[PDB]
């Protein structure tokens, strides 16, 4: 079973250098080219370079002005991509992919590594209620939610009533604020007629800061 | 470098009907050996890219037979004979004829369904946040189609630009709708400077723009 397993998401400061790993198994590491391809927002896929681990031979995309270094460690069947002098526009998901000879090209892909380039410091979120009101009713339901504000880096997770409430939930993509911190809202739709007797609580978890918060959302 | 270009940028598809997407290269990808070095990849939502078609017309074993690829040396088409819901995602063409390898900009395939107007809700800032010195007001557009929508904030009937941010969900896998949040952020001070807070929503499913509003403090 061919597998390519990459390192986890990485936050890097501007001007730094990141090292992304790609651990290979299920085939002969030495004898296939490992390629690196990135996917920046608003961009398609962009090729960075490749390495043939057997002899260490490489090819690089000239566009990256010598900022990319690709290496291999045969002892662990791991390929690496390093990108130096990071800029905000280097924020992207970086994939490794194995070339399969005889015309197939990039059949096997790693799961990708998100590299986020930012000067921001780790900070846990503040959690505020989005209270149901006469202005958040439709049909026979009411919308309510939680505003998870001012945290860094991604990700946060949100559940409702400790996981009991999953139907009607929308947790929006986080938005990057001008401050450099993230914010997102999670909303759920429920029957309006039982807002006085049903309790709704959002469970927020921010692992990078080891922050957990439970916020009760009530009518107002 | 060889430039790869795709069209359209976005393609709403109807399960059960055919769909086709196009690609072109700035240079012929035809080799003297008769092979055309054009590849089609698909990145399904939340997944890594996968290879569907190698060398213009060859289906990877296991890929459903409804997929096919064809073209000339410079212009290519990926065809789905009969679309299935599981075919959504971003399709990329790519060439490996020359270094550097290059990819098209992608075509995002999503599900076409009937127009559905958003349900609109508005949320004043919580007292808790206000006490912290900031005011976030949230407008929610729930379960609508298509994705295109316009949200304008009015405060005391004055249009406010620059102080809001939108977030939109990806298409729901079951009902094929979108939801959207628009959040207007003000300092607690600037916030108290005004009274009427209103969200005006324009969408194809609405005969006329809908407004949800509240009076600061009074309910």
């Amino acid at each position: 079973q061919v597998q390519l397993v990459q390192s986890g998401a990485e936050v890097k400061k501007p001007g730094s250098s990141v090292k992304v790993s790609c651990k290979a198994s299920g085939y002969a590491f030495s004898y296939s080219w490992i390629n690196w391809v990135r996917q920046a927002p608003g961009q398609g896929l962009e090729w960075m370079g490749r390495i043939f681990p057997g002899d260490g031979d490489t090819d690089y995309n000239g566009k990256f002005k010598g900022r990319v270094t690709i290496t291999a460690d045969k002892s662990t069947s791991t390929a690496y991509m390093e990108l130096s002098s990071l800029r905000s526009e280097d924020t992207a998901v970086y994939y490794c992919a194995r070339n399969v000879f005889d015309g197939y090209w990039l059949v096997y892909w790693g799961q990708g590594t998100l590299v986020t380039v930012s000067s921001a410091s780790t900070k846990g979120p503040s959690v505020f209620p989005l209270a149901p009101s006469s202005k958040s009713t439709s049909g026979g339901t009411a919308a309510l939610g939680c505003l998870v504000k001012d945290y860094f880096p991604e990700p946060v997770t949100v559940s409702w009533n400790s996981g009991a409430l999953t139907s009607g939930v929308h947790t929006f993509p986080a938005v990057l604020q001008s401050s450099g911190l993230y914010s997102l809202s999670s909303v759920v739709t429920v029957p309006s007629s039982s807002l006085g007797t049903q309790t709704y609580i959002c469970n927020v978890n921010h692992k990078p800061s080891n922050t957990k918060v439970d916020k009760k959302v009530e009518p107002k | 470098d060889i430039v790869m270009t795709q069209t359209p940028l976005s393609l709403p598809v109807t399960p059960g009907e055919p769909a086709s997407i196009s690609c072109r290269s700035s240079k012929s990808l035809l080799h003297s050996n008769g092979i055309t070095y054009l590849y089609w990849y698909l990145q399904k939502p939340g997944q890594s890219p996968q290879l569907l078609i190698y060398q213009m017309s060859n289906l990877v074993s296991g890929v459903p037979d409804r997929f096919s690829g064809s073209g000339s040396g410079t212009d290519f088409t990926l065809k789905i004979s009969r679309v299935e819901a599981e075919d959504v995602g971003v399709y990329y063409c790519a060439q490996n004829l020359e270094l550097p390898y290059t990819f098209g900009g992608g075509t995002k395939v999503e599900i076409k369904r009937t127009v559905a107007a958003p349900s609109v809700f508005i949320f004043p800032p919580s007292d808790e946040q206000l006490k912290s010195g900031t005011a976030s007001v949230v407008c929610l557009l729930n379960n609508f189609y298509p994705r295109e929508a316009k949200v304008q904030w009015k405060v005391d009937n004055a249009l406010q630009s620059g102080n809001s941010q939108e977030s939109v969900t990806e298409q729901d896998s079951k009902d094929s709708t979108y939801s959207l949040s628009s959040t207007l952020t003000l300092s607690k001070a600037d916030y108290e400077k005004h009274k009427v807070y209103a969200c005006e929503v324009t969408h194809q499913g609405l005969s006329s723009p809908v407004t949800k509003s509240f009076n600061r403090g009074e309910c």
Binding site: - | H31, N96, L97, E98
Partner: peptide, 24 residues
Amino acid sequence: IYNCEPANPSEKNSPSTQYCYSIQ
């Protein structure tokens, strides 16, 4: 002369190319 060269960069060092050269 028979050409064993890889048709494109993704066949550089391929088993087919190596074998081709081996029997020339």
